[PDB]
Amino acid sequence: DIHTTAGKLADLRRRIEEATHAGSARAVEKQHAKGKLTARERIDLLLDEGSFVELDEFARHRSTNFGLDANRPYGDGVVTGYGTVDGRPVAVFSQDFTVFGGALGEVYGQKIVKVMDFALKTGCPVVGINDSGGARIQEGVASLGAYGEIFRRNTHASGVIPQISLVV
Amino acid sequence: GPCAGGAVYSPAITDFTVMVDQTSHMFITGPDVIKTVTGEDVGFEELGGARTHNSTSGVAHHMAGDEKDAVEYVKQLLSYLPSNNLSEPPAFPEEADLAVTDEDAELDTIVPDSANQPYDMHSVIEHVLDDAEFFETQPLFAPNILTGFGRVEGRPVGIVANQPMQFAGCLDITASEKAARFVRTCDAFNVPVLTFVDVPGFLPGVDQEHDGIIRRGAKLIFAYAEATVPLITVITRKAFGGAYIVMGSKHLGADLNLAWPTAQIAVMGAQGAVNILHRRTIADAGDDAEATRARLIQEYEDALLNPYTAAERGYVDAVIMPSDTRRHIVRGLRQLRTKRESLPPKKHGNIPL
Amino acid sequence: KAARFVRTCDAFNVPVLTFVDVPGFLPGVDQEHDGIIRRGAKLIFAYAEATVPLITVITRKAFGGAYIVMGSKHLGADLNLAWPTAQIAVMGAQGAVNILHRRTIADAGDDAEATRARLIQEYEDALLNPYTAAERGYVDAVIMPSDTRRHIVRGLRQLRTKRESLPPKKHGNIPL
Amino acid sequence: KAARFVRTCDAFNVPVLTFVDVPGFLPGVDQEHDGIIRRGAKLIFAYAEATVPLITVITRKAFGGAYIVMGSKHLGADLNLAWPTAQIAVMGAQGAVNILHRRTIADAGDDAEATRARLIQEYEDALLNPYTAAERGYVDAVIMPSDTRRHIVRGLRQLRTKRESLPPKKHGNIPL
């Protein structure tokens, strides 16, 4: 059902499904076709096996600009979370090109932040895996604001926590 | 033994106060001087006996059978705290099972389908803590909420949670005070605070308001906002209005806020919410007034009373499967234990009193 | 009420003047059953915690625990003064005698009160004043009621440069 | 040129007034091959790191990375103001329509160039102003060019006492 405890659970399983499969079945093929690996595949190859814990997985945006509300994928374009690397704590965000061209959005940037605030407060590096195709033009300045709060964290934490950029 | 007059105040200031059944007493004014002034008739045990303070005044933290059970208590109490604030609480590190134990699964069904049927929170806690060992404090006072200690991977933690078994795990004066003071204790001595949530709202009553619930209920929030130790919050079911805010929500600086699918995080109850949002659309078509007011309530709780709305905004970092609560807290404290966070410089804060 | 103020004044470097005349704590089951303990303790927490200049003037009554609470030098007060009309005693004479003189009060049922009420007078005349406390230093001085201001004035002039600090801690743990 | 100035003015406690009006980043291959990605990033680092009063006044143009860079509020500015003649947008209308409206303009090769001109107008007439940002609090207020001085004045009065600081570090690691 859906009003029971067993359905409310089964429901989740359903969500964690289309969630890890936010991009199109074709976008992934294309991605692979170019040799590139999917965002979630970059995280797994990097972090220690089974140490990845995702944050903001079921987050979505709220931009009604240019009818973008018809496509509100879970994750909103980026996979962020924390995990270990060679036994040491590491925080990481992986830009998902198979979603809106992996363009920076409001909720998309907020996540990258939530992770940089966590990586700094707990003193662990921040592996950033990029693929962003550009700013999400529909949201206008909101996407510019997102890039900022991030640039500011890059500075405030420059020299405080290793920050590595993976441009693929 | 006896603790009469101003002397009683030294125990007040200290952290945890342990008492024994009818072997000790605490009181400012003697039972005799009380009668010669008001005319009230009460016996020692009733005025300031162990059972009294361990359930009426909120001054005591434990009631033991005899002096032996007490001494053993304090020893346990000391085993969860550091010898001073300049250090983390002692530890006996031991790797945990990263897989899903048959115990973990048990949670997948702990919450009944009935939004009105209670389940014992202790069970939820005992499933995350090592050896399912849960050391509870003030079990008789403010039963609507549980506060104690335990260990996760050998490292001492602190637990605060709502007890649906009692008064529907509501928040009230006695509860706020109980937890608040506990949280600040766990914070002052670098003990992380795991909190499990399920609260409908604040216990109604003119007595509450008149007895200063506004200035005493904040205590809980101040305690949480002020804290800096690792803060992991688990939402199992109920999450309404200020009650949600108060229970170590992300807006109060929590580090990891989990939420089970069996949880509903909303501004207010669906039953009462609609009576304000559709007060108009309901007036119309008296033809089946309550067959619309009922249809709405259903569409509300089926659309808003869940964690996913919040989950979007990021108010919760994930909607986990009950059976993964332990694997979460474990693999989540390992990171948070290095949490460096501080407050603005000050002689001290100004928490409500 | 007071506790919250003293703290508000402390956090904001505001000197706290306190005038005393308290007999004791309102007797009542209610008080006890309402945590008067964890709540009355707050008042001493504030004072002990404080670091701003503290000037305590006892105008009359000052007994037992109450005394302690009202900015006593035992809580860090910098200057404690007391009028000659003040009475700094561990407790009230009447109730004090019914304790200390139990085996000596029973004797001679004849005049069971002309030996009691008479003995009570001896106490309120020997101990119900400020000179006992002052004797040791619990009070910096006894002064003419009319010199209160002159004291508070010339006093605060010296304490405005008071440097005090509690042990380092994330925060305290005041009884809530 | 600006980077090293904003840092000098910071390291010595000199508030930085910023007046913006920029279209974007000078296009050119030589630029890319010279290091604009890291040599330009300095400007934002200088601003982000800054901890002095930063009052930003936008006079006209404010587009993409250029807006961000020029003392935006997303970098730590204290007061960002904007004249009614400010274009706070993610990009110019000319280019914005090419991407935003590609299939909605492809239709009718003829009557297209007027469908474009129309769009470009509807867009700028509804997006190249400051009011957008003004709703998200990105700019503290849209003023009258006449109140620029009065705003910087009454504003530098409040910020002259601002205490800001970055995480503790041996030193930052700004691009070079």
**Which CATH number goes with the domain that contains A35?**
3.90.226.10
The residue behind tokens 């230093």 is: C137
* Residue D152 structure tokens: 């910087």
**Count: domains in chain C:** 1
Among residues B50, B3, B51, the alpha carbon closest in space to that of B29 is found at B3
- Indicate the residue of D48, D100, D172 with minimum beta-carbon distance to A151: D48
CA dihedral sign of residues B56, B126, B218, B320? negative
Q: How many CA atoms lie within 13 A of D56 on its CB side?
A: 25
* Residue B88 structure tokens: 């983390």
The residue behind tokens 């170590």 is: B248
Instruction: Round to whole Å and give the CA distance between B115 and A26.
Output: 42
Q: How far apart are the first and last CA of chain D?
A: 13
What are the residues facing A127 on neighbouring strands?
Answer: A92, A164
Disruptive mutation site among D70, D74, D176 for chain A (greatest number of A CBs within 10 Å): D74
Instruction: Round to whole Å and give the CA distance between B10 and B4.
Output: 11
Chains D and C touch each other (3 or more Cβ pairs < 8 A): no
**Count: domains in chain A:** 1
Q: Which domain holds residue C137?
A: 1-176
* Residue A163 structure tokens: 């920050």
Instruction: Round to whole Å and give the CA distance between A75 and A61.
Output: 9
Instruction: Round to whole Å and give the CA distance between D102 and D97.
Output: 7
Q: Which domain holds residue A77?
A: 1-168
Q: How far apart are the first and last CA of chain A?
A: 43
* Residue A31 structure tokens: 């991605």
Interface of A with B in 137-166 (CB under 8 A): none
Question: To the nearest whole angstrom, how far is the Cα of D69 from the nearest Cα of chain A?
Answer: 8
Residue of B nearest to C38 (CA): B12
Residue B58: in which H helix or E strand, if any? none
Which residues, including other chains, have CB under 8 Å from residue B325's CB and lie 6 or more apart? B104, B107, B124, B127, B128, B234, B258, B260
Which residues, including other chains, have CB under 8 Å from residue C40's CB and lie 6 or more apart? B9, B12, B28, C25, C69
Hey, which residues of B are catalytic here? 5-6, 242-243
Pairing of strands A78-85, A53-55: antiparallel
Instruction: Round to whole Å and give the CA distance between C45 and C136.
Output: 24
Among residues A96, A90, A86, A93, the alpha carbon closest in space to that of A19 is found at A96
Pairing of strands B18-20, D87-89: unpaired
The residue behind tokens 């970092």 is: B317
Q: How far apart are the first and last CA of chain C?
A: 13
**CATH number where D50 lies:** 3.90.226.10
Instruction: Round to whole Å and give the CA distance between B263 and B238.
Output: 6
Instruction: Round to whole Å and give the CA distance between D151 and D169.
Output: 35
Neighbours of chain A (3+ CB pairs under 8 A): B, D
Chain C touched by B87 (CB under 8 Å): no
Chain A CB contacts of B336 under 8 Å are 122
Question: Do the Cβ atoms of B74 and B307 come closer than 8 Å?
Answer: no
DSSP assigned state of B55: I
Sequence-distant contacts of B311-315: CB under 8 A, at least 24 apart: B311/A58, B311/A59, B311/B259, B312/A58, B312/A59, B312/A60, B312/A62, B312/A107, B313/A59, B314/A56, B314/A59, B314/A107, B314/A110, B314/A111, B314/A114, B314/B250, B315/B249, B315/B250, B315/B251, B315/B257, B315/B265
Chain C CB contacts of B181 under 8 Å are 173, 175-176
Disruptive mutation site among B312, B313, B330 for chain A (greatest number of A CBs within 10 Å): B312
Interface of B with C in 166-185 (CB under 8 A): 177, 180-181, 184-185
Q: Which ranges of B79-120 would DSSP assign to H, the alpha helix?
A: 102-105
